[PDB]
Every structure is written in C-alpha cells, then in structure tokens.
Amino acid sequence: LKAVRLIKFLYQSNPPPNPEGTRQARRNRRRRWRARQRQIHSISERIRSTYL
Amino acid sequence: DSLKAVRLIKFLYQSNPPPNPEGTRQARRNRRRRWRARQRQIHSISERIRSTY
Amino acid sequence: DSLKAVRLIKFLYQSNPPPNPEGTRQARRNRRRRWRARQRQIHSISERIRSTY
Amino acid sequence: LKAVRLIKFLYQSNPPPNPEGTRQARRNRRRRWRARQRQIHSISERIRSTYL
Amino acid sequence: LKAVRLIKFLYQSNPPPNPEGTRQARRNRRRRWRARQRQIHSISERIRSTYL
Amino acid sequence: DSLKAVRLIKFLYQSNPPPNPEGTRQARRNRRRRWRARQRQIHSISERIRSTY
RNA sequence: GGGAGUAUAUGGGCGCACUUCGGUGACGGUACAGGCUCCU
RNA sequence: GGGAGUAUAUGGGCGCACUUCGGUGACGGUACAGGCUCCU
RNA sequence: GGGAGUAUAUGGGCGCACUUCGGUGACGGUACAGGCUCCU
C-alpha cells in the first residue's frame, strides 16, 4: 500500500514498555522502546526516499 | 506498482548485511539475534505488501 | 467599558451564521446542534460579562 | 472582565475526555477534546483582536 | 566529580510532588517543584560557568 | 583539582547573602528558611565533592 | 483544565521548643497559602 | 527524578534444545544488563 | 501505539418528545461513529 500506511504499520508493531518493576528496569524498557522507535524512523526514511 | 515493491523489499534485505561471527558465543548469538530481528521486520513489511495484493 | 463588551457579544453572535437546512433530517439536526453549541458558548461569555458587572 | 480571564474561562469550560473504554473510543474522545480546544483558540483570537 | 554529575545529583535531590489531594493543592505542589527545578538550573549554570 | 572545588564551594557560599531581618516574625523566619535551604544545598554539593575524594 | 514566568520573590496561623510570659526559635517547613502577567 | 544520543552498537549467565560431552543453537530474547556524553 | 490537521467540517440509527402517523424536534448529543492527509 502507500508508504505512509506501511510506516504506520511499523510504528504499530512497536509494543509499549512494561510499567511494572523498579525505576531502573522501567527506565531500561523505555530506552529499548525508544531505540526501536529510532530504528523504525530510520528504515521509514530509507523506505520513503525510494519506492515513490 | 508491484515491481517497485519487490525491488524495495530486495533492497531492504540487501541493505542488511550478515552479522559478524567473532567474539564469544553470546556476542555472536546476539549479533545474529539483532540481524534476525531486522530480517523479521523486513519480512513483516513484505508480507503486508503481499497481503494487500 | 460596557459598550465595548456589548458590541463584542453582538459581533460574536453576528459572526455565527445560521446552519444549512439541507440534506437528511440527521444532518440538519447536527448542523443545528453545532450552531446551538456556538450560540451557547457566546452566551456563556456574555453571561460571564454580565456577572462581573 | 479582562479578555485573558474570559479566555481562561473558555478553556476551563472544556471537559477532559473519558479515560475509560476501548483504545479507539478514548482516541475519538481525545480528538473531540482537541477540536474543542482548537475552537476555543480561534474564538479567543477573534476576541483578543478586538475588545481592546 | 565532573560538573555534569554534580548537576545530575542536584536534579536527583528534587522530590516529585504529591499526586494526592485537591486539584488546587496538587497544582501548588507542582508549582513548588517547578520553582525548585528553576533554582537547580540557575545554580547549575553558575557552577558550569566556572569550575572548568 | 581539589583547589578549584574548594574555591567553587566558597564562591557559592559567598554568593548567598544573609536574609533580611525585617518585617513580621514569620516573614523573617521564612527568609531565614529559604536562606538555610540554599546553604543546605551548597553543603550537599560540597559534601558530595568530599565523598568522591 | 494544562503550562510558563514574576521567584536567589512574598508570608499567613496552627502545632512544638525556649522564655524574664513581653516575646524568641538558621524547629514541624524540601510543608502550606497562591496572588499578578501571559500562553494554551 | 525525567529526556536525548552513542545504537543498523555492546553481550553477560541462567534456563531449554542438540551433542562426538569438547562444544553448538538465524531457541526462551521484541527478554535482560546499562555504561559513556550532553540536556533538564 | 502516539500526535497534528482537514474541522466555525461530515452525519449515522437507537432511545425519548410531538404528530394530521406522512413526518417533525435550536431533545438524550459538550454524546457517538472516524474517514482522508502528514508526522512520529
């Protein structure tokens, strides 16, 4: 489908971090999530650059 | 149309080089794991393209 | 002072044109509802101005 | 009173959305709330432009 | 230690406000917290300016 | 190294002037309280510097 | 409703401590009160 | 405390699976550990 | 998943009220439905 839709699908495929646990654990989970988001952004950029 | 999508997927796959088989077993394992994750994402994309066709 | 406030309220009211009585009964109803909401807000303003006088 | 006070009253008259329900429902409620906020901003702008 | 570390220690020494209570009380607590943050920022700036 | 830290602490302390002993007992009290808070923060800093030495 | 700033600001009366009973306390207080300005 | 980035990065030892018992696994792992830099 | 905008926009069928039973209601509705575009 449209590139935008695929990208939205990619962002949808990133699960939110677990709120339970110690502050450090939750912090780590958040950081992992953010890393995933960064990756999604990068690959989304490389997708949008071509394919259209 | 479809050709552009196929070329896109093949491009994404080609842009994902194999992991480095060096260091401890754990290090190699997790490099292979990250790599496999990337591959998995690309396949998710391709499969979604196939699903809408 | 007060004259400016009255002119303001009358201006806001005049700036809110009547809804379009076209289409299905539901469409007309909800146009009238949005319109009535705007009118209600303007009256809330005016009433608050009257309350502080 | 002062225009700013009236505007604050307008923003006070916008109820926060219901957190309960499905993700889609909550999403819709949030969107409605945001629309209301946009309206408040517009009319606040048109008020502040005159009246002073 | 490094100035940055000391500053981080200062920001760590600012306790988050109490979520319990009335809206006005919580508002006040948040404002106090924000004031504390502003202070921390100011003194952090005056520290970083010198000492290095 | 350490000299710069000592100079820093003394500087922070010197940059914190005594409160104003004027007005009601409460006002003076809370000026002294704010002042004491600032002093306390500076000492927290100095003590942390001493702890890492 | 939310936010920013004024703010290295303002200080109100309860409770403790001390007292020569008038008051005093760099004590509870990193508490509490939240005005004014603007933004949303 | 919060955030950003380093990071298309780093990999530690538990449990499974396999085994020629030395090890191996693109298995639990989208888990888990969170250093360094800066911001607040 | 989140956000912005289109939007001073679009209006779908349940329940009330009225009715000449065809319909009507600036009634529940500041409810509810959430498409399209882009961002993350």
Numbering used by the authors:
A (entry chain C), D (entry chain C), E (entry chain C): 13 to 64
B (entry chain B), C (entry chain B), F (entry chain B): 11 to 63
Manuscript excerpt for this entry:
Rev cooperatively assembles on the RNA using its oligomerization and RNA-binding domains to form a Rev hexamer on a shorter, but functional ∼240 nucleotide RRE. This assembled RNP then presents Leu-rich nuclear export sequence (NES) peptides to interact with the host export receptor, Crm1, targeting these RRE-containing mRNAs for export. The binding of Rev to the RRE is nucleated at the stem IIB hairpin, where the α-helical arginine-rich motif (ARM) of Rev binds in the major groove of the RNA and makes an extensive set of sequence-specific and electrostatic contacts. Crystal structures of Rev oligomerization surfaces depict a central hydrophobic core that mediates interactions between Rev subunits and positions the ARMs on one side of the Rev oligomer to bind RNA and the NESs on the other side to recruit Crm1, highlighting the modular nature of the Rev domains.
We circumvented these problems by making RNA complexes with Rev 1–70 harboring the oligomerization-disrupting mutations, Leu12Ser and Leu60Arg, which forms a stable Rev dimer, and a Glu47Ala surface-entropy reducing mutation, which aided in crystallization. The overall architecture of the complex shows the RNA held between two Rev molecules arranged slightly asymmetrically in a V-shaped topology, with the two Rev ARMs buried in distorted major grooves positioned on opposite sides of the RNA. The Rev subunit bound to the junction site forms an extensive surface with the RNA that causes the dimer interface to pivot around a single residue, Ile55, known to be critical for dimer integrity and function. This altered conformer results in complete repacking of hydrophobic residues at the dimer interface, formed by residues Leu18 and Leu22 from the first helix and Ile55 and Ile59 from the second helix. Interestingly, the bound conformation buries less surface area at the dimer interface than the free form (1000 Å2 vs 1500 Å2) and also shows looser hydrophobic packing (the two Rev subunits are ∼3.2 Å further apart), suggesting that this bound dimer is energetically less favorable but is compensated by the energy of RNA binding of the second Rev subunit. The weaker interface may be further compensated by hydrogen bonding between the well-conserved Gln51 residues symmetrically located between the two subunits and observed only in the bound form. The junction site in the RNA forms a structural scaffold that helps orient the Rev subunits.
